[PDB]
Amino acid sequence: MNECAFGTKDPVYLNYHDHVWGQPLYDSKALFKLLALQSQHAGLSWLTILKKKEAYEEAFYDFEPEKVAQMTAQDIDRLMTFPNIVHHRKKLEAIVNQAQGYLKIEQAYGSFSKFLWSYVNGKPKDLQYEHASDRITVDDTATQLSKDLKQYGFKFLGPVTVFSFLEAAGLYDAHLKDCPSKPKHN
Ligand SMILES: [Zn+2]
Numbered sequence: 697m698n699e700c701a702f703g704t705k706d707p708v709y710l711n712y713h714d715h716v717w718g719q720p721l722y723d724s725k726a727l728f729k730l731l732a733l734q735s736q737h738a739g740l741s742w743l744t745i746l747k748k749k750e751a752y753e754e755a756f757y758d759f760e761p762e763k764v765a766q767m768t769a770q771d772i773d774r775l776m777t778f779p780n781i782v783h784h785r786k787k788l789e790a791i792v793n794q795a796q797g798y799l800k801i802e803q804a805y806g807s808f809s810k811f812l813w814s815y816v817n818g819k820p821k822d823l824q825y826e827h828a829s830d831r832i833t834v835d836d837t838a839t840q841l842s843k844d845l846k847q848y849g850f851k852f853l854g855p856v857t858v859f860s861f862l863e864a865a866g867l868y869d870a871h872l873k874d875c876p877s878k879p880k881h882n
Pocket residue numbers: 697700701713871872875876877878
């Protein structure tokens with residue numbers, strides 16, 4: 697478990713490793729929320745964004761895309777002094793652009809979940825890692841998904857970030873073979 701969880705001992709981070717990271721997530725709105733939170737990570741510890749999750753929920757309508765998508769510069773202006781979120785204007789604007797892109801995807805394609813899972817043919821890609829040093833941080837699929845999302849107006853979701861999202865959402869299973877949290881795949 698310890699090796700799989702990147703040597704982190706903070707129990708809030710371990711909780712995320714144990715109960716979220718890499719567990720196949722098929723719900724569209726939950727996938728949107730996780731992707732949006734991932735976009736906020738750059739230059740900070742993930743535990744920073746995790747401890748702030750409830751504050752982000754309060755800032756962004758519980759990440760409900762129809763509601764987030766309607767937000768304007770006036771909202772972002774207010775959110776720049778909203779307590780316990782990161783006050784990075786382009787990061788905050790990005791969440792609104794992402795929600796708009798989600799709605800565009802659902803209009804053009806049907807389901808945001810089906811859109812994303814299409815990139816791994818509807819089931820997790822088990823990366824079959826045995827050592828934490830086996831882990832890559834980007835690949836061709838994440839790069840193309842990043843590019844494709846960008847076309848619908850998503851922001852702050854480059855290739856490495858998208859790769860991290862795929863592992864987080866369980867589209868990729870990056871758990872080590874003997875980790876107690878490695879999901880079963882059929
Ligand atoms: Zn693990």
